């Protein structure tokens, strides 16, 4: 095939040009909804902790498939290991308002806490880059899914639910220094 | 399961610095606590300090708490007790230890899985 390539206008060429034949495909597992349906980790969690997408690796699965949209929904689900109660307030809440017990307070049970939280920003859509300011590199402060609190938190792990994304931006791999590919080890069995 | 590999020790005189260093043999996703436990000669194992990794939440002791720092690499997945100022006292054998199983501030300096034979640092005056 050929076309005016500064037009910008969509190609997709097939194996059938020259005698090919185009096979059928599930693309289930590159589904939005599907793989940013998976519990992620938060590396600095601290007694009181905002919960933001943000924090999320910028290289892991959920977290750089994050970095590659402008724009966003989601519900939430979190699983968080404390010491003694934990509250969380929603989004807008005074930070003095994470002492009281009219909040929702989960009281510790053994291995951990898993909750699901609704998306409770004023904005219609969350976004992951800014450009200029909200007061009169960071984002808005109202960029979040609300605060947790406990006396210490060990470790807190993140769910997206019902998840949008919007506006694609640049995803990229590990770079190839001198090699002709980048070799690594791939699971095999012993002997 | 693990084992770890212990780095830096040797022997100083009174008002140097050392690094000791300590990275594990496997690189599993859980939220171990890197500790150091120094045993005097002629005496028991005791605690000195200790470091989570998720965040740089530390442990010290009472002996150790202005002149001993304790970091951790997110990268190459190591553990660093810069001790400075060393005092004569500071003679011991240093080991480090995992504690993979619970990881909560108020237990942080109890209950120990894999330690990794220890490394000498012996002071003088």
């Known amino acids: 095939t050929t076309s005016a390539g500064e037009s910008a206008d969509p190609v997709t060429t097939t194996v059938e040009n020259y005698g090919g034949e185009t096979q059928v495909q599930r693309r289930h597992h590159t589904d939005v909804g599907f793989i940013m349906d998976r519990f992620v980790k938060i590396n600095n969690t601290n007694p009181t902790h905002v919960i933001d997408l943000m924090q999320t690796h910028q290289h892991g699965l959920v977290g750089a498939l994050l970095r590659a949209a402008t724009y966003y929904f989601s519900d939430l689900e979190i699983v968080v290991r404390h010491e003694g109660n934990l509250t969380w307030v929603p989004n807008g809440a005074p930070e003095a308002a994470l002492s009281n017990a009219g909040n929702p307070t989960a009281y510790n049970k053994a291995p951990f806490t898993r909750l699901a939280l609704p998306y409770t920003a004023p904005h219609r859509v969350l976004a992951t880059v800014y450009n200029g300011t909200s007061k009169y590199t960071q984002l808005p402060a109202s960029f979040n899914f609300g605060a947790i609190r406990a006396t210490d938190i060990s470790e807190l792990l993140v769910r997206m639910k019902r998840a949008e994304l919007y506006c694609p931006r640049p995803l990229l791999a590990v770079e190839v220094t001198a090699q002709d590919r980048h070799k690594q080890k791939i699971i095999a069995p012993a002997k | 399961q693990v084992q770890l590999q212990e780095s830096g020790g040797g022997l100083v005189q009174a008002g140097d610095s050392l690094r000791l260093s300590c990275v594990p043999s496997?690189?599993?996703?859980?939220?171990?606590?890197m500790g150091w436990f120094r045993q005097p000669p002629g005496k028991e194992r005791e605690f000195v300090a200790a470091?989570?990794?998720?965040?740089?939440?530390?442990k010290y002791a009472a002996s150790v708490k202005g002149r001993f720092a304790i970091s951790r690499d997110v990268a190459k997945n190591a553990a660093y007790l810069q001790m400075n100022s060393l005092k004569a006292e500071d003679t011991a054998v240093y080991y480090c230890?995992?504690?993979?199983?619970?990881?909560?501030?108020?237990?942080?300096?109890?209950?120990?899985?894999?330690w990794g034979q220890g490394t000498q640092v012996t002071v003088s005056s």
């Open positions: 230890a995992a504690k993979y199983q619970s990881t909560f501030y108020s237990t942080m300096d109890v209950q120990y899985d894999y």
């Open positions: 470091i989570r990794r998720s965040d740089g939440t530390t």
């Open positions: 496997v690189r599993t996703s859980d939220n171990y606590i």
